[PDB]
Amino acid sequence: VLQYTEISNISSDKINILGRTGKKRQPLPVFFNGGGVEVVVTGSELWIDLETDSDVNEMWVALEINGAFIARQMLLPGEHSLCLFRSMEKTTPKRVRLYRELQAMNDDPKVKLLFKGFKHDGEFQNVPVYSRKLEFIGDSITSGEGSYGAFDDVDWIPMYMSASANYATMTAKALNADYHLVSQGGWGVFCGWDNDVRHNLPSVYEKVCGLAKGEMNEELGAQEEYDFASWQPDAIIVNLGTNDVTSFNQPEFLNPDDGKTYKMRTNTDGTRNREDELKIVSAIIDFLTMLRKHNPNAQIIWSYGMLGSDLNLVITEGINKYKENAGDEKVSFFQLPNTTMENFGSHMHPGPKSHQNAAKELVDYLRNKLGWFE
Amino acid sequence: VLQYTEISNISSDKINILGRTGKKRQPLPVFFNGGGVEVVVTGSELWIDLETDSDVNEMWVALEINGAFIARQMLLPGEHSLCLFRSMEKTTPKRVRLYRELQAMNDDPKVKLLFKGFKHDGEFQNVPVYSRKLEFIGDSITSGEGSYGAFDDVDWIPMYMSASANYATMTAKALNADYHLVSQGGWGVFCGWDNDVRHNLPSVYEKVCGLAKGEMNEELGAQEEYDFASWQPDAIIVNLGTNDVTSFNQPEFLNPDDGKTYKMRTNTDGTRNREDELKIVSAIIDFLTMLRKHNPNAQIIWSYGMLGSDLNLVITEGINKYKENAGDEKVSFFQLPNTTMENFGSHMHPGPKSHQNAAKELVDYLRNKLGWF
Amino acid sequence: VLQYTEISNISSDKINILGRTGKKRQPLPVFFNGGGVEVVVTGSELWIDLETDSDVNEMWVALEINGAFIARQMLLPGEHSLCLFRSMEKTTPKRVRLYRELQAMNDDPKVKLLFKGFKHDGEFQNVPVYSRKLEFIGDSITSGEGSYGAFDDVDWIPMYMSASANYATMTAKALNADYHLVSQGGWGVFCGWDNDVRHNLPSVYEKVCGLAKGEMNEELGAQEEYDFASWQPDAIIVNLGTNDVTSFNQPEFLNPDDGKTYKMRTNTDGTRNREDELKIVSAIIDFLTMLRKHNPNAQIIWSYGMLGSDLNLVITEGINKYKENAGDEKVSFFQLPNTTMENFGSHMHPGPKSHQNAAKELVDYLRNKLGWFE
Amino acid sequence: VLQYTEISNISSDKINILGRTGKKRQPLPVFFNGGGVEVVVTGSELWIDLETDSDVNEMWVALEINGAFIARQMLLPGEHSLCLFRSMEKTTPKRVRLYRELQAMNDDPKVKLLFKGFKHDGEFQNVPVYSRKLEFIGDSITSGEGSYGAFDDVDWIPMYMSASANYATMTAKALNADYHLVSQGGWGVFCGWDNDVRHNLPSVYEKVCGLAKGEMNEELGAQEEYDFASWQPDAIIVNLGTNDVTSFNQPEFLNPDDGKTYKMRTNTDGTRNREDELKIVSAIIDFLTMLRKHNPNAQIIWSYGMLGSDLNLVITEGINKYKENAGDEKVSFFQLPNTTMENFGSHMHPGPKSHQNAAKELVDYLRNKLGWFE
């Protein structure tokens, strides 16, 4: 006989909730990629009860036991009782981490992941205490898009995305740190790759999950303001700009809302338009002020370069102008290594090896920057 | 809507069946680790209908689309409808490979995996043709035991075993080769690590799946003689001996079947008992004979060393004596690189990196030996 | 027997002179690290006749045959006849490159290396034509200080310096490019590591070899203005800043020239003084102007990071302010990877593996920037 | 002021002599590749006085200070005074290792290296004590032939050979071990690559340096019986067989010393002549006996495979028959990794990387076999 324990009935000491949470606690909505739970349990068997819904973009999850990747799978709409381990030695504790592989989906109001409770024959023990906290904000790189799948695959579908093979989770793991991911493929600091001015991360940063819209998501608490005071990160890693630079080489965008045409322009010369560059610069300044406002003590580190480094000067202009004007001494720039021909995954995006290389250089930087040498 | 096509109703040029098959075609019994199917299909959606049974040791499978690892999961007893992909661009063909992660289980008559058919909106295309064929015979290394899981995990359960992170499948993939895996954790060429003389790979080699025993498996055709003529490998990789050397440092074993006790002995000198070494030599001679008989043209390559190389001399003594007596010029010894501290997986067994290292050296050996440049 | 040919008598197409040269042609003065000659010769034997002088800091050279490192040795004062190869097959050509390992020595008027001629039994053939040209401006990293020697060796001596194991020559080689190295251990863009304001690279850039001073050096043509027009690089790699950062944590410097004390200062909270930061910013602006002036078409790439990246924002402020004012769309910033624990050489400076890692990242960057995919 | 000290006048506790010695101690003959001396000295400078002779094949040496490669150079006939270091901090002890890069030359009676003494302003300190000892017996792989030079270079001359980049010295260094190298390029256990039955390592093993022949070498004591009792290795690594395999595909050899023609035969179906295979087996048994006789306690390890493993079965047949008849439980076979496409040096032989890979695998084997985890 397995006991059933509702997720909200577990002592805060005996569960780590990974990722941003709002007001709803039973069942637990897991809004973000990398989001989920970690428990440490004895016993022979563990199952998690969950509910999922979706249409075009189905849910994916991944499981790690004692820090090691074990499983990865799709979940189709409905109730599931998912077996996390079985036939194990009863007396020894196992650390179990199950998390969402798929990013929040801005244009998809149906997709959701809800954790209800656990079935178990053993007992819950105290979970590791993560004093170190890292927030990651980004585009599809931070969504781990291309981290699975063959070189030539191009379909924009969930199976190619992950938190399981991802520089951010690799960095958090190496540094023994709790982590939040906030990301959206194709989105920029100012506009999306396709010149879509609505597709910027800043506009969506402040709600519990601003990227989860519609009635159903509203019932889950996603559109309420996020309680920043409850989770203050030591550092905020900002990996944005790739899509902003891409937009300069992309056709003009007609906006369905405010019926105007937007285009980040390139000079006849081949260089970027300056006032257009300045729109990014200002967007950067505004975003940095937003971040400082909600995280008064965090080290903000703009970390950019896994898919080219052409926005180097524009990014650092934004930071420098913000810094001098605000007297902010805890804002840095760190360039990530570029993905070489050999290390691409699918969608011509960074694969596992590029993520690993990026995590290695980011971890080294954070050790020195934060004094996290141990 | 979704068409249903039974696995046996896909014409040969539009399916690759991976692994030893017997007389049963519908549904398809998936006997061995690394066994399964590969198809290439258009359409937006593909499902596979399958049945599984198990008790203590539940079934695991892994999915690869266009050669890339996508998913890996447990399957509990019953009929399942597994979605292999969905929401895809309809016109592009996708190569889909779905295989078993769990070895055949000698002492577990209930465990099984059956493939019934596909649900699909697209059409089956010609699959790639693998004229190059490789058979791998081994112990838990070849079962990929330890290829998943943390350093200190020790439970002997399915989640830790794989074909997905495995030197054998990495080797086959690199060389663009069809492969068969025949393996059993803890088993030797002569005896198991615990001195169990019944636990030797030669004794199960000749059947479709000799490691699939009991009534249900018999009905699946596992206990009939394997038709070797239908699938002849270019090379046979034999990775045995690790468990034979281990037995020398392990307590005696009481055989439940004859009441006799068995113990591979070491002298109060620290050295292996010479008479016992010779039982391994004889098992090797006998197994090479068996292998030649069923595979008259294959290059036999004893590949050993991922968990120590202590048996190098006994193995080559076996090979050398067999070869001289048989006049066999197509038998070799290749040493695999040892697993070092930075490269252990779980169970103190080879991890992904060790498998990778071993595959690189083996691939290079096979290119040169077989002219596979 | 062995013919003798003065370096001056070898036709321009039969010799590649590496490094800046002035008016003196016979004998040929080799002013800079990485400086020297490349020839392609048949015959069984080749010797070079040379002259060297020194006292505290003896000369070192290294030999490459067909692009492969062969030899490295010190040369003490006097005339030398150095055997480059012997007992070889007579009919086969070999490419021979002999170059200086030691940087120009600013405060050492005696140290010199002069190439006089070759003793040879075979014939000189046409040497490769390098249309690609790269200038590298740097501190001890670009001097390869630490590229030889054990982890704990600390003596500030020539044997530890090289162009033979050096990210710059590695980059040049990978790219099939002619190269000039101009560097001084301990120097910055504004001041030296010890707060010494006369120890900046801009101040020595414009002469043939501003770092070769005194009478005998003046006779060698070193203090004459360099003819920039005669050697125009496709890209200029600037690796400076490490010593400017260090000066902030270093005791004040008394300048023996003008008797003033100089000190880059740190605020109570540990951050750098803004005004002192601005002095580095200005020096950067001024140097970029100097570079653009003498090199109207070169891509200037500030490449910094092998020993810490804390000057990222200051460097990027300098570049951005310079750029916004001039027309210049041909200045970039590129961050080099940091030297980790297991990749230090001697003097706690980057070792062979660190140079190698840096060269790999820089090469990838240069390919994509300059269109040198082959 | 420079004191002069003869090599034979340094206390045994203040010098490590590397390589086989005979009864000639002053001056010290350096017979073998990897042979030479190690001292540790204070002071600002150190010179070594040495004599060398040669004709076609000139002497090469390499210098390591505190375990780090510093220098490599040719030495032409005559007396030399080599400066090993200078201008150093007087009080710090420096460990200095100077060794021969060139193998003993069987058919070159003129080539020689002698160490006479040191000029030094500091004092000799105690040297490290290497209680662990390793003997390496091999062919050109063990002579490090190909370890320097470009991929397509083919001339059989000294500059391409080394102990400085060599699996044997890499192994010894890793295990903190004294080492002796005994090697001859082209030579086998039974015959040379060209079917020359005189070119076998067993025949020269027992003398101080059996490969140093002729009157001059006789006066150096090379042709006297080696005193094995004075230096007993923990392990003997035998890397032979590559040339024995090769001979099967090479034209017959006309032996000068008798009138006879020798040829290892290949059957008209492509396989090796069994009777000729058995000649190698007998040579192996015979050599193993010889090794056991002079080394009663050593672990003998046949380590083969850096240039193919085709003789795997014949070698282990030799070992197996030897061990059975002798009851010898301290003889092993370890197959070394094959040199792959990316890892060749010059002459289609193993380059630095292949040596390194071989050393790492061999080091791991010896740690386990000899219990050298410390």
Side-chain angles (χ1 to χ4, degrees), chain D residues 3-178:
Chain D
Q3 308 289 156
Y4 185 73
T5 308
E6 284 169 52
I7 184 156
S8 62
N9 286 331
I10 303 159
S11 294
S12 68
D13 66 321
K14 303 202 206 306
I15 184 157
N16 283 132
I17 295 177
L18 306 175
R20 288 198 183 177
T21 57
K23 284 177 272 145
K24 189 82 194 311
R25 278 305 192 103
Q26 185 67 226
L28 195 258
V30 188
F31 290 119
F32 286 98
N33 46 311
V37 297
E38 177 172 74
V39 297
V40 6
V41 291
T42 56
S44 73
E45 62 181 280
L46 212 221
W47 300 62
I48 187 164
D49 287 330
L50 54 79
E51 184 180 60
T52 192
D53 206 358
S54 56
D55 200 342
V56 175
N57 299 309
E58 81 287 350
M59 191 53 56
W60 280 73
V61 293
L63 171 68
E64 299 184 357
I65 285 156
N66 296 333
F69 178 88
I70 300 290
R72 177 176 199 259
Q73 68 166 272
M74 173 197 301
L75 296 164
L76 285 171
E79 316 292 299
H80 304 259
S81 198
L82 291 192
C83 185
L84 301 187
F85 66 78
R86 66 185 301 281
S87 311
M88 295 202 85
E89 215 280 310
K90 295 159 173 289
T91 60
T92 324
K94 277 73 69 172
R95 186 159 59 83
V96 181
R97 192 183 277 198
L98 209 226
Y99 52 88
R100 184 176 161 144
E101 295 276 59
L102 216 218
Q103 59 166 214
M105 298 290 296
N106 190 252
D107 308 305
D108 187 334
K110 186 160 179 70
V111 69
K112 73 166 182 186
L113 180 62
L114 315 177
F115 293 172
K116 293 180 168 200
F118 294 92
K119 290 161 168 171
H120 55 102
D121 61 335
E123 307 173 26
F124 296 101
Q125 314 301 305
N126 288 159
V127 293
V129 179
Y130 308 115
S131 60
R132 297 173 173 178
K133 306 177 188 315
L134 294 169
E135 192 182 45
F136 293 88
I137 303 163
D139 52 40
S140 76
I141 302 170
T142 305
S143 293
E145 206 268 293
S147 63
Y148 284 86
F151 179 84
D152 296 303
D153 283 27
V154 297
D155 296 354
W156 301 91
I157 57 165
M159 77 161 117
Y160 300 125
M161 267 185 262
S162 85
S164 61
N166 185 300
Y167 81 96
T169 56
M170 278 166 174
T171 297
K173 181 171 291 198
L175 297 168
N176 185 225
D178 191 12

Side-chain angles (χ1 to χ4, degrees), chain B residues 119 163 239 255 266 274:
Chain B
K119 296 192 301 202
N239 190 347
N255 196 154
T266 77
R274 180 56 184 163

Side-chain angles (χ1 to χ4, degrees), chain A residues 229-259 261-262 264-340 343-373:
Chain A
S230 74
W231 202 92
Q232 284 297 285
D234 299 272
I236 296 172
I237 312 297
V238 193
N239 192 344
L240 287 178
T242 303
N243 296 306
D244 298 274
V245 90
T246 296
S247 70
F248 285 93
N249 301 311
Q250 216 56 49
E252 55 179 29
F253 169 80
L254 192 51
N255 179 11
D257 287 330
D258 150 62
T261 295
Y262 296 88
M264 297 285 92
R265 296 155 305 179
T266 300
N267 295 319
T268 169
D269 194 39
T271 56
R272 283 158 297 185
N273 177 294
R274 226 282 138 165
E275 56 260 50
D276 290 346
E277 278 191 345
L278 217 53
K279 282 152 144 278
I280 298 161
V281 171
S282 187
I284 287 168
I285 305 158
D286 296 345
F287 189 41
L288 290 170
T289 77
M290 173 182 291
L291 291 177
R292 182 54 70 211
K293 184 181 174 212
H294 297 290
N295 310 91
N297 298 304
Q299 294 281 9
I300 301 167
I301 301 143
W302 212 284
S303 311
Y304 160 85
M306 286 169 76
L307 287 177
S309 63
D310 235 288
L311 206 59
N312 257 191
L313 301 179
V314 177
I315 288 162
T316 51
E317 180 181 334
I319 297 165
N320 282 315
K321 277 174 190 188
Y322 164 75
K323 155 191 182 199
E324 47 91 349
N325 197 240
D328 193 327
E329 299 169 310
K330 297 186 170 193
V331 188
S332 302
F333 172 84
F334 181 71
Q335 213 193 47
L336 300 168
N338 201 24
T339 310
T340 72
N343 292 339
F344 284 99
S346 60
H347 298 65
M348 76 186 71
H349 278 51
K353 274 60 176 161
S354 177
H355 284 105
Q356 288 172 216
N357 298 172
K360 177 186 287 183
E361 291 179 25
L362 182 57
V363 170
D364 177 67
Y365 178 85
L366 292 170
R367 292 203 187 279
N368 298 300
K369 186 71 175 174
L370 305 172
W372 293 356
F373 300 103

